[PDB]
Design an enzyme around this catalytic site. Structure first.
Site, short mmCIF file in Angstrom:
data_model
loop_
_atom_site.label_atom_id
_atom_site.label_comp_id
_atom_site.label_asym_id
_atom_site.label_seq_id
_atom_site.Cartn_x
_atom_site.Cartn_y
_atom_site.Cartn_z
N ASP A 1 0.88 -1.16 0.00
CA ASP A 1 0.00 0.00 0.00
C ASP A 1 0.92 1.22 0.00
O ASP A 1 2.06 1.12 0.44
CB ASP A 1 -0.93 -0.03 1.22
N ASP B 1 -0.01 4.95 0.85
CA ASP B 1 -0.23 5.96 1.87
C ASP B 1 -0.10 5.39 3.28
O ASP B 1 -0.78 4.44 3.65
CB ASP B 1 -1.60 6.62 1.69
MG LIG Z 1 -2.65 3.28 3.50
#
Ligand SMILES: [Mg+2]
Ligand SMILES: [Mg+2]
Lengths: 396, 396
Positions: B183, B185
């Site tokens: 992922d 962020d």
């Molecule tokens: Mg995230």
């Protein structure tokens, strides 16, 4: 915090020792820096490096709590201020595999002696196989610029003592091998296909002589190939399928490939032999890459020639490089396995070049040599244990 | 041959001990079955299992030669007939990683206690890091059908004791992980890009609230995405590059990727964020796969909408599967790393799902959780040591 203490517990192994020690340590301001524990043949060693208040480490209470708790159940413990002590040991530089059937004490003794002579420290020893061959691993710390001397010394030990001895880089990068190629004849498959073809022409004699002559490097591979295949001139092409069905895998070959698939290896074969005999097997073995020569056929009969280009000694290395580029695997992470002088450039190009029951011409320049009739001994050189193989296989 | 003998040498480590022992053994008909040696904190344990003539093993001479040679230099040795003794130990079933800063003795004590309670045997303990976090590995043998109980018990210990505790399959297949997705962020990159975009609209407030609201799972990812990106309606597209250049990698991210490349991992990112902000970074990080959403732009201005299809919670798992199929990597050998409820299906689909400084909704279902602000602690969970990282890096 403040000050560091080393606690070392040794003796006959008993259950609950590990929990007991840290439970004691928790009554003091102990935070952990390093724990090392192993049990070997019911002998426990537990080394615990901690930091704790200067307050605590300067008092008899920590010592008395630990000593009382450890000595009561029957083990030994030492406690001493550290501060000038390595927190965590450095990784080994190399690993050494010793394979034999048997491995005499004399053999192993000679290995340990050559190791000590070159200032090489033994960091760990363990067994990696009890079958089909005894397998022992030593992880070592080799002084910089000495591993050449070491391989030389250990190849001498290897021939004198009748064990295989391989020395390998034990660095993060080099351990993650991801691609392997096998020569076919006398490596993945038993015997020489070209001799099985020649026998149908009543020529196995001539062709065996030249084959054994080419694999020791006494002849140009192309000229020897041309003379041998010529002996097939006039055979019906049906002979090809017939020989395909007489092929026996090398003992340990299915296990080798299967285990290599578990590890996500890309697997291929590179042969001076014939594509039509090899493909209905590479398909059966679910291989990713095949390079081979090709028999010329006119009117459903072999002509005794090969359709160029000829995979020669240089061609095999060229094929490895090709396979590795397509597969996205750097040469350092490639493995090549072969038995003949035909395979010299290929083993040299590969990250790890392994000679399998090989002619002298190849063993003299291979990274590692295997002298037992079990292809799965390759797996041990790749950092696999027999127990790990059997475990995964039992899980199916 | 004929009969088996176990020789066990213990005591303060000294050079030459190993060679001395096998040199002695060579004066008797000794062939080797298994050697195990380690030195921990200057304490040597050398267990040697051999077979030798019934003739020799029934005589005091073997004993006297060994005992004399070992005791002279100051170590202890025991010798006993075996025959009913395991030649080579079975592989561990699992491995446990304990990461903390600090790791209290109490913490480690609780781990060892839960382990013993479930009949789990500790086969080995070692340190795997001294920085940026203390890291300890236990390799264990878990009774069949108990590893669920074990993960539960150790997650409870983990929250109560402020350490990370991960339990992983230690089988040949599962250890050879070959593909990882991050992922973006708050996982690979610091902070929330959509909040950095919103701040240019003076809306960071609203958007942060909803972002923190979506990552804990209290909202549908698509509806939250639509409300958040809407707040950008009217921003010039130039803002995209501007935010791209304000992005900070997570501490340890370069080290994580670099080391993962050494191991031949295929690396990718799967994001609910925006392709245009992510690509000029995935390119800089030499990633193999990117999946992300896409901002709608009209006349060089953002509209506040996304161009479908939306990567939602299901979309992330779908992206992992896609990546793994193209890469030729089975799902069991895949790793997924994330922090938000957005990432739940992706971690569940992956062989190893790792929650990194994650919301509770994700930690509750992740295979493993990391609570320290160092992405490279992922590497420890992948069987890498700090020393191995530093070694390879120093070699450059
Ligand atoms: Mg995230
Ligand atoms: Mg051959």
């Amino acid at each position: 915090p403040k000050v560091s203490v080393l606690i070392t517990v040794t003796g006959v192994d008993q259950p609950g020792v590990t929990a007991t020690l840290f439970e004691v340590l928790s009554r003091h301001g102990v935070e952990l820096l390093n724990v090392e524990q192993v049990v070997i043949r019911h002998r426990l060693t537990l080394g615990v490096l901690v930091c704790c208040p200067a307050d605590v480490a300067d008092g008899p209470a920590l010592r008395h709590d630990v000593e009382a708790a450890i000595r009561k159940v029957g083990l030994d413990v030492s406690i001493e201020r550290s501060d000038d002590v390595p927190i965590i040991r450095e990784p080994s530089t190399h690993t050494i595999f010793v394979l034999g059937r048997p491995i005499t004490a004399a053999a192993f003794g000679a290995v340990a002696r050559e190791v000590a002579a070159l200032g090489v420290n033994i960091d760990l020893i363990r067994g990696v196989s009890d079958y089909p061959v005894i397998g022992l691993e030593l992880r070592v710390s080799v002084p910089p610029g000495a591993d050449g001397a070491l391989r030389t010394a250990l190849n001498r030990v290897s021939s004198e003592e009748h064990v295989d001895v391989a020395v390998e880089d034990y660095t993060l990068e080099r351990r993650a091998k991801r691609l392997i190629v096998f020569d076919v004849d006398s490596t993945l498959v038993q015997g020489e296909v070209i001799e099985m073809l020649a026998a149908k022409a009543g020529a196995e004699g001539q062709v065996a002589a030249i084959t054994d002559a080419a694999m020791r490097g006494e002849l140009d591979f192309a000229q020897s190939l041309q003379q041998r295949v010529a002996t097939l001139a006039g055979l019906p092409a049906t002979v090809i399928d017939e020989v395909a069905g007489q092929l026996e895998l090398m003992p340990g070959a299915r296990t080798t490939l299967r285990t290599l698939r578990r590890l996500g290896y890309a697997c291929g074969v590179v042969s001076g032999g014939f594509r039509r005999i090899i493909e209905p097997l590479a398909e059966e073995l679910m291989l990713d890459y095949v390079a081979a020569n090709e028999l010329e056929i006119v009117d459903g009969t072999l002509t005794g020639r090969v359709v160029g280009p000829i995979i020669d000694r240089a061609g095999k290395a060229t094929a490895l490089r090709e396979f590795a580029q397509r597969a996205g695997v750097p040469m350092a992470q490639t493995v090549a396995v072969g038995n003949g002088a035909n395979n010299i450039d290929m083993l040299a190009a590969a990250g790890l070049g392994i000679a399998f029951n090989a002619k002298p011409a190849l063993r003299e320049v291979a990274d590692a040599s295997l002298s037992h009739p079990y292809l799965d001994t390759v797996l041990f050189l790749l950092g696999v244990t027999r127990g790990e193989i059997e475990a995964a296989d039992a899980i199916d």
